[PDB]
UniProtKB/Swiss-Prot annotation, chains A, B:
It comes from the Archaea. It comes from Thermococcus kodakarensis (strain ATCC BAA-918 / JCM 12380 / KOD1) (Pyrococcus kodakaraensis (strain KOD1)). It catalyses: L-asparagine + H2O = L-aspartate + NH4(+). This is L-asparaginase. Chohan et al. found that divalent metal ions and EDTA do not have any significant effect on enzyme activity, indicating that activity is independent of metal ions. In another study, Hong et al. showed that activity is enhanced by Mg(2+), significantly inhibited by Co(2+) and Ni(2+), and moderately inhibited by Ca(2+), Cu(2+) and EDTA. Unfolding studies suggest that urea cannot induce complete unfolding and inactivation of the enzyme even at a concentration 8 M. However, in the presence of 4 M guanidine hydrochloride, the enzyme structure is unfolded with complete loss of enzyme activity. The lineage of its organism: Archaea, Methanobacteriati, Methanobacteriota, Thermococci, Thermococcales. Is active at a wide pH range. Optimum pH is 9.5. Optimum pH is 8.0. L-asparaginases are widely used in fried and baked food industries to prevent formation of acrylamide, a neurotoxin formed by the reaction of asparagine with reducing sugars. TK1656 is highly active over a wide range of temperatures and pH, reflecting its potential in the food processing industry. In addition, its high thermal stability may facilitate its handling, storage and transportation. The active site is at T11 (nucleophile), T85 (charge relay system), D86 (charge relay system), K156 (charge relay system), Y274 (charge relay system). Each subunit consists of an N-terminal and a C-terminal alpha/beta domain connected by a short linker loop. The N-terminal domain contains a highly flexible beta-hairpin which adopts 'open' and 'closed' conformations in different subunits. The high content of arginine and salt-bridges as well as the low number of Cys and Ser likely contribute to the thermostability of the dimer. It holds the Pfam family Asparaginase_C. SMART domains: Asparaginase. CDD domains: L-asparaginase_I (cd08963). InterPro entries: AsnA_fam (IPR006033), Asp/glu_Ase-like_sf (IPR036152), Asparaginase/glutaminase-like (IPR006034), Asparaginase/glutaminase_AS1 (IPR020827), Asparaginase/glutaminase_AS2 (IPR027475), Asparaginase_C (IPR040919), L-asparaginase_C (IPR027473), L-asparaginase_I (IPR041725).
Length: 328, 328
């Protein structure tokens, strides 16, 4: 049993020196301060690849993290990645599209408090991630508190509480209690060979449809990006009265993908349900179904990295690649 | 006891036409289909002001709804507004800033299912709204299920489930059980005279900070609007590495307000907590504290309607006008 811990930064790593310097402690220091390891059965190796506040994460970093994960598939039985919470769900989603048929568990985790703080959540989060890394099953997951969640189905829903990450429109995968994994839902696990497929187009923009959003703004946005995620109300639709945003969307969607998700946290979209939705479909809008906002964005980046054909972008967005979207 | 029901449309007023669902029923039809009125003590009158899918609501409509509410303060003891769910929280927030010291309860409500459907939520939502309109206390509130919530503290968090509206970072006001109101939290109720103050600038944009968001896009957005709401990660901050959005923000914030809220649903922002936050504060960014996204947007519209002085906009955004933000 050999596990790799990949360190990438985040609050979990934050520490001050005796002279005031602000350091991002290494994966080895983190495990030590968490009280992990001091024993075998499972050999734990460590590597540090980045030291970022996860606010600063860019899509090029997903390629770096992804390359390190995929190359580790030869040597290890499980992987845990320590990462900032701010963009944890974006990295977990993007890695799920960039890496097909992972042969081992790959578990991202972080904490809301620094490991150096005395009531830190980091020790618990690491234990949960490591227990699943050694006893769980293949795929890309996020560990937080005692929960294991599908990487394409998580969001950061609290900015302050310890229970900061939830699974959205999809059940929790498993819970860790002591050294046991209690499985709630095992996803479909692809028998195929591991594939690394990193091409993505980072030039996408995520905008909220709001009363008062002007045609002019949406035009300015459309001319400066390659893809748009619109965050609509409820089941989804586009305003056409007074500020006719539908007209801007039908023109844009001739040349670039426009994907619609919802402002709601739960339930996703259904553009079939209302006329405002149906007009949106007629104008070329791609529905995000029940996908998280993180998964919608990273999947579109991944789509655009593989094609500029609008019909093939539609097929990719609506096909279930790695558990991100409910099908039929 | 005289109550006014003001009709505005919404799914609650929907009927299935030959061309699909329209928001065509009047307030009178809604009450009738709900089995309401059928009691001695309260006289219920009706007025219809709009018949829109709430996706089509624009800020100019808040003035129309507001004028009808304020004029009704002379004749009535309570008001219920029937409204679509898609923008209910925007209307409730905006009316809280446009109407100071309402002298009676003003309760907005809606439904997720048409009143004509057999398992409709509309009957219950109306009863809750009407019971509080007659036995509650002054202010602007939203009724949904058995709950009464502060109008500046709600969001639509589900696009499908019946418990679609939650109070965010602030307790529920009351619960209605049969014909009783059980108070959970009584807010501060302003003794002053009713004031109608409708000036707002609708030219604001709400954009999500995402990995891959380019300086070019944020510039294009800034030049086409008068105010920006940025939706940042966690406790809030702006990316400065690779895609230096902080630089775009420091230039914009010299001329226009840039307000920062969070992508999380709970907990709001605290730009003091991290360096990425502190650089954001140094660049002139206005924190939204713990406000809902709906309240942040409508408050900024209201601010910009009263001044283009950036310091006075800051003071308004951070001052607690109507329960929207937790103080000092």
């Amino acid at each position: 049993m050999k596990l790799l811990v990949l360190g990438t930064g985040g609050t979990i790593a934050s520490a001050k020196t005796e002279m005031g310097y602000k350091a991002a402690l290494s994966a080895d220091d983190i495990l030590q301060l968490a009280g992990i390891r001091r024993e075998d059965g499972a050999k734990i190796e460590t590597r540090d690849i980045l030291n970022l506040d996860s606010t600063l994460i860019q899509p090029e970093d997903w390629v770096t993290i992804g390359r390190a994960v995929f190359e580790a598939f030869d040597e290890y039985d499980g992987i845990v990645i320590t990462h900032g919470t701010d963009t944890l769900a974006y990295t977990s989603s993007a890695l799920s599209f960039m890496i097909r048929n992972p042969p081992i568990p790959v578990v991202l985790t972080g904490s809301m408090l620094p490991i150096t703080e005395p009531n830190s959540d980091a020790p618990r989060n690491l234990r949960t991630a490591l227990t699943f890394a050694r006893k769980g099953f293949p795929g890309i997951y996020v560990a937080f508190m005692d929960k294991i969640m599908l990487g394409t189905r998580v969001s950061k829903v609290h900015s302050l509480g310890l229970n900061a990450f939830q699974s959205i429109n999809y059940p929790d995968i498993a819970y860790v209690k002591g050294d046991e994994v209690l499985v709630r839902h095992k996803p479909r696990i692809g028998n195929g060979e591991p594939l690394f497929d990193p091409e993505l187009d980072p030039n996408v923009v995520h905008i909220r449809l709001t009363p008062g959003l002007s045609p002019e703004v949406l035009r300015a946005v459309a001319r400066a990006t390659d893809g748009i995620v619109l965050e609509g109300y409820g089941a989804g639709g586009i305003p056409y009265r007074g500020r006719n945003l539908l007209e801007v969307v039908s023109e844009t969607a001739r040349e670039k993908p426009v994907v619609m998700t919802t402002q709601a946290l739960y339930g996703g979209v259904d553009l079939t349900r209302y006329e405002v939705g149906r007009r949106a479909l007629e104008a070329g809008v791609i529905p995000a179904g029940d996908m998280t906002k993180e998964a919608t964005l990273t999947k579109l980046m991944w789509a655009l990295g593989h094609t500029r054909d609008l019909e093939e972008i539609r097929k990719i967005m609506e096909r279930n690649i790695a558990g991100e979207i409910t099908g039929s």
